[PDB]
Amino acid sequence: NAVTATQLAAKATTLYYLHKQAMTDEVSLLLEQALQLEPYNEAALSLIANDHFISFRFQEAIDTWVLLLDSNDPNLDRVTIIESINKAKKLM
């Protein structure tokens, strides 16, 4: 019935990328709500990490990705996430 965490994170993602990649209160709240429903939501944590990365906060990007890796979702693309961590690590 209700909107899913991924659907909330998808709206957050649209408002983010199409609007100057700003973490506004609106984007942050949609993400918070995705993570209230699913604490390890891939779409949500991935936006947060990417936003850190884009902002050159490489340590915080890594922390978010490492947190995402603790997901128990068998389908999680760990490979791409760890490539992201590795890039970030090299830019620090």
mmCIF file with all atom_site columns, C-alpha atoms in Angstrom:
data_model
loop_
_atom_site.group_PDB
_atom_site.id
_atom_site.type_symbol
_atom_site.label_atom_id
_atom_site.label_alt_id
_atom_site.label_comp_id
_atom_site.label_asym_id
_atom_site.label_entity_id
_atom_site.label_seq_id
_atom_site.pdbx_PDB_ins_code
_atom_site.Cartn_x
_atom_site.Cartn_y
_atom_site.Cartn_z
_atom_site.occupancy
_atom_site.B_iso_or_equiv
_atom_site.pdbx_formal_charge
_atom_site.auth_seq_id
_atom_site.auth_comp_id
_atom_site.auth_asym_id
_atom_site.auth_atom_id
_atom_site.pdbx_PDB_model_num
ATOM 1  C CA . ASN A 1 1  ? 0.000  0.000   0.000   1.00 0.00 ? 1  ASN A CA 1
ATOM 2  C CA . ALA A 1 2  ? 2.296  2.785   1.278   1.00 0.00 ? 2  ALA A CA 1
ATOM 3  C CA . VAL A 1 3  ? 5.180  4.326   -0.656  1.00 0.00 ? 3  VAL A CA 1
ATOM 4  C CA . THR A 1 4  ? 8.349  2.263   -0.271  1.00 0.00 ? 4  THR A CA 1
ATOM 5  C CA . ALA A 1 5  ? 11.690 3.480   1.132   1.00 0.00 ? 5  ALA A CA 1
ATOM 6  C CA . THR A 1 6  ? 13.167 3.154   -2.365  1.00 0.00 ? 6  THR A CA 1
ATOM 7  C CA . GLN A 1 7  ? 10.338 5.259   -3.820  1.00 0.00 ? 7  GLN A CA 1
ATOM 8  C CA . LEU A 1 8  ? 11.023 7.966   -1.194  1.00 0.00 ? 8  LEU A CA 1
ATOM 9  C CA . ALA A 1 9  ? 14.767 7.805   -2.012  1.00 0.00 ? 9  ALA A CA 1
ATOM 10 C CA . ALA A 1 10 ? 13.989 7.978   -5.725  1.00 0.00 ? 10 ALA A CA 1
ATOM 11 C CA . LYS A 1 11 ? 12.092 11.251  -5.281  1.00 0.00 ? 11 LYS A CA 1
ATOM 12 C CA . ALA A 1 12 ? 14.958 12.534  -3.158  1.00 0.00 ? 12 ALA A CA 1
ATOM 13 C CA . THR A 1 13 ? 17.351 11.557  -5.982  1.00 0.00 ? 13 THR A CA 1
ATOM 14 C CA . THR A 1 14 ? 15.260 13.385  -8.605  1.00 0.00 ? 14 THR A CA 1
ATOM 15 C CA . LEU A 1 15 ? 15.088 16.568  -6.493  1.00 0.00 ? 15 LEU A CA 1
ATOM 16 C CA . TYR A 1 16 ? 18.848 16.306  -5.852  1.00 0.00 ? 16 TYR A CA 1
ATOM 17 C CA . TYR A 1 17 ? 20.433 15.675  -9.371  1.00 0.00 ? 17 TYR A CA 1
ATOM 18 C CA . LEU A 1 18 ? 18.048 17.821  -11.333 1.00 0.00 ? 18 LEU A CA 1
ATOM 19 C CA . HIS A 1 19 ? 18.374 20.764  -8.888  1.00 0.00 ? 19 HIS A CA 1
ATOM 20 C CA . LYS A 1 20 ? 22.047 21.617  -8.598  1.00 0.00 ? 20 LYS A CA 1
ATOM 21 C CA . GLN A 1 21 ? 22.901 18.560  -6.478  1.00 0.00 ? 21 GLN A CA 1
ATOM 22 C CA . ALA A 1 22 ? 21.781 20.342  -3.293  1.00 0.00 ? 22 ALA A CA 1
ATOM 23 C CA . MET A 1 23 ? 21.057 18.420  -0.089  1.00 0.00 ? 23 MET A CA 1
ATOM 24 C CA . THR A 1 24 ? 18.023 20.654  0.759   1.00 0.00 ? 24 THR A CA 1
ATOM 25 C CA . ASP A 1 25 ? 15.766 20.116  3.779   1.00 0.00 ? 25 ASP A CA 1
ATOM 26 C CA . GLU A 1 26 ? 13.272 18.520  1.324   1.00 0.00 ? 26 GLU A CA 1
ATOM 27 C CA . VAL A 1 27 ? 15.819 15.996  -0.005  1.00 0.00 ? 27 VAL A CA 1
ATOM 28 C CA . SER A 1 28 ? 17.159 15.304  3.499   1.00 0.00 ? 28 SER A CA 1
ATOM 29 C CA . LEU A 1 29 ? 13.692 14.609  4.918   1.00 0.00 ? 29 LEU A CA 1
ATOM 30 C CA . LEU A 1 30 ? 12.769 12.208  2.043   1.00 0.00 ? 30 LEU A CA 1
ATOM 31 C CA . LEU A 1 31 ? 16.059 10.378  2.682   1.00 0.00 ? 31 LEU A CA 1
ATOM 32 C CA . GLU A 1 32 ? 15.468 10.339  6.449   1.00 0.00 ? 32 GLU A CA 1
ATOM 33 C CA . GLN A 1 33 ? 12.099 8.744   5.797   1.00 0.00 ? 33 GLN A CA 1
ATOM 34 C CA . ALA A 1 34 ? 13.495 6.143   3.422   1.00 0.00 ? 34 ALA A CA 1
ATOM 35 C CA . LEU A 1 35 ? 16.017 5.235   6.171   1.00 0.00 ? 35 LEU A CA 1
ATOM 36 C CA . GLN A 1 36 ? 13.275 5.206   8.854   1.00 0.00 ? 36 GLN A CA 1
ATOM 37 C CA . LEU A 1 37 ? 11.531 2.489   6.789   1.00 0.00 ? 37 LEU A CA 1
ATOM 38 C CA . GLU A 1 38 ? 14.720 0.693   5.634   1.00 0.00 ? 38 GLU A CA 1
ATOM 39 C CA . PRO A 1 39 ? 17.879 1.626   7.631   1.00 0.00 ? 39 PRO A CA 1
ATOM 40 C CA . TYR A 1 40 ? 20.097 0.056   4.932   1.00 0.00 ? 40 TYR A CA 1
ATOM 41 C CA . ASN A 1 41 ? 18.171 1.289   1.904   1.00 0.00 ? 41 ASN A CA 1
ATOM 42 C CA . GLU A 1 42 ? 20.555 1.205   -1.045  1.00 0.00 ? 42 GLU A CA 1
ATOM 43 C CA . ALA A 1 43 ? 19.064 4.094   -3.021  1.00 0.00 ? 43 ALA A CA 1
ATOM 44 C CA . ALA A 1 44 ? 19.083 6.381   0.066   1.00 0.00 ? 44 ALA A CA 1
ATOM 45 C CA . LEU A 1 45 ? 22.536 5.588   1.477   1.00 0.00 ? 45 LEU A CA 1
ATOM 46 C CA . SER A 1 46 ? 23.915 5.674   -2.009  1.00 0.00 ? 46 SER A CA 1
ATOM 47 C CA . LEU A 1 47 ? 22.636 9.244   -2.597  1.00 0.00 ? 47 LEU A CA 1
ATOM 48 C CA . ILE A 1 48 ? 24.082 10.341  0.756   1.00 0.00 ? 48 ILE A CA 1
ATOM 49 C CA . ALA A 1 49 ? 27.523 8.777   -0.038  1.00 0.00 ? 49 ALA A CA 1
ATOM 50 C CA . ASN A 1 50 ? 27.527 10.221  -3.550  1.00 0.00 ? 50 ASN A CA 1
ATOM 51 C CA . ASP A 1 51 ? 26.672 13.653  -2.190  1.00 0.00 ? 51 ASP A CA 1
ATOM 52 C CA . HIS A 1 52 ? 29.624 13.437  0.248   1.00 0.00 ? 52 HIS A CA 1
ATOM 53 C CA . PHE A 1 53 ? 31.885 12.298  -2.617  1.00 0.00 ? 53 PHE A CA 1
ATOM 54 C CA . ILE A 1 54 ? 30.776 15.135  -4.967  1.00 0.00 ? 54 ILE A CA 1
ATOM 55 C CA . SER A 1 55 ? 31.386 17.519  -2.065  1.00 0.00 ? 55 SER A CA 1
ATOM 56 C CA . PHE A 1 56 ? 34.966 16.128  -1.642  1.00 0.00 ? 56 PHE A CA 1
ATOM 57 C CA . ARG A 1 57 ? 34.050 14.759  1.827   1.00 0.00 ? 57 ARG A CA 1
ATOM 58 C CA . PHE A 1 58 ? 35.792 11.504  0.944   1.00 0.00 ? 58 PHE A CA 1
ATOM 59 C CA . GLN A 1 59 ? 35.974 10.143  4.506   1.00 0.00 ? 59 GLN A CA 1
ATOM 60 C CA . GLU A 1 60 ? 32.254 10.623  5.069   1.00 0.00 ? 60 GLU A CA 1
ATOM 61 C CA . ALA A 1 61 ? 31.498 9.041   1.667   1.00 0.00 ? 61 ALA A CA 1
ATOM 62 C CA . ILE A 1 62 ? 33.484 5.951   2.730   1.00 0.00 ? 62 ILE A CA 1
ATOM 63 C CA . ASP A 1 63 ? 31.769 5.795   6.131   1.00 0.00 ? 63 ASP A CA 1
ATOM 64 C CA . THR A 1 64 ? 28.359 5.784   4.390   1.00 0.00 ? 64 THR A CA 1
ATOM 65 C CA . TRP A 1 65 ? 29.415 3.075   1.908   1.00 0.00 ? 65 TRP A CA 1
ATOM 66 C CA . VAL A 1 66 ? 30.938 0.935   4.674   1.00 0.00 ? 66 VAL A CA 1
ATOM 67 C CA . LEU A 1 67 ? 27.629 1.270   6.569   1.00 0.00 ? 67 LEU A CA 1
ATOM 68 C CA . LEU A 1 68 ? 25.726 0.256   3.410   1.00 0.00 ? 68 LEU A CA 1
ATOM 69 C CA . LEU A 1 69 ? 27.972 -2.845  3.107   1.00 0.00 ? 69 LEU A CA 1
ATOM 70 C CA . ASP A 1 70 ? 26.535 -4.110  6.423   1.00 0.00 ? 70 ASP A CA 1
ATOM 71 C CA . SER A 1 71 ? 23.240 -4.622  4.546   1.00 0.00 ? 71 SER A CA 1
ATOM 72 C CA . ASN A 1 72 ? 21.981 -8.215  4.605   1.00 0.00 ? 72 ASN A CA 1
ATOM 73 C CA . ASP A 1 73 ? 20.475 -7.816  1.118   1.00 0.00 ? 73 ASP A CA 1
ATOM 74 C CA . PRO A 1 74 ? 21.991 -10.614 -1.015  1.00 0.00 ? 74 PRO A CA 1
ATOM 75 C CA . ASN A 1 75 ? 21.477 -8.553  -4.206  1.00 0.00 ? 75 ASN A CA 1
ATOM 76 C CA . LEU A 1 76 ? 23.588 -5.538  -3.011  1.00 0.00 ? 76 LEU A CA 1
ATOM 77 C CA . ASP A 1 77 ? 26.268 -4.618  -5.583  1.00 0.00 ? 77 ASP A CA 1
ATOM 78 C CA . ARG A 1 78 ? 29.159 -4.765  -3.134  1.00 0.00 ? 78 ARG A CA 1
ATOM 79 C CA . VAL A 1 79 ? 31.660 -4.713  -5.957  1.00 0.00 ? 79 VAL A CA 1
ATOM 80 C CA . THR A 1 80 ? 30.644 -1.213  -7.182  1.00 0.00 ? 80 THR A CA 1
ATOM 81 C CA . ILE A 1 81 ? 30.416 0.070   -3.616  1.00 0.00 ? 81 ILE A CA 1
ATOM 82 C CA . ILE A 1 82 ? 33.936 -1.123  -2.772  1.00 0.00 ? 82 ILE A CA 1
ATOM 83 C CA . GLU A 1 83 ? 35.299 0.381   -6.044  1.00 0.00 ? 83 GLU A CA 1
ATOM 84 C CA . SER A 1 84 ? 33.736 3.683   -4.861  1.00 0.00 ? 84 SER A CA 1
ATOM 85 C CA . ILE A 1 85 ? 35.404 3.302   -1.434  1.00 0.00 ? 85 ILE A CA 1
ATOM 86 C CA . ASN A 1 86 ? 38.688 2.654   -3.142  1.00 0.00 ? 86 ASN A CA 1
ATOM 87 C CA . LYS A 1 87 ? 38.477 5.722   -5.409  1.00 0.00 ? 87 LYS A CA 1
ATOM 88 C CA . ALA A 1 88 ? 37.534 7.927   -2.369  1.00 0.00 ? 88 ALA A CA 1
ATOM 89 C CA . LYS A 1 89 ? 40.400 6.489   -0.297  1.00 0.00 ? 89 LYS A CA 1
ATOM 90 C CA . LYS A 1 90 ? 42.864 7.380   -3.084  1.00 0.00 ? 90 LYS A CA 1
ATOM 91 C CA . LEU A 1 91 ? 41.573 10.971  -3.216  1.00 0.00 ? 91 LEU A CA 1
ATOM 92 C CA . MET A 1 92 ? 42.024 11.604  0.492   1.00 0.00 ? 92 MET A CA 1
#
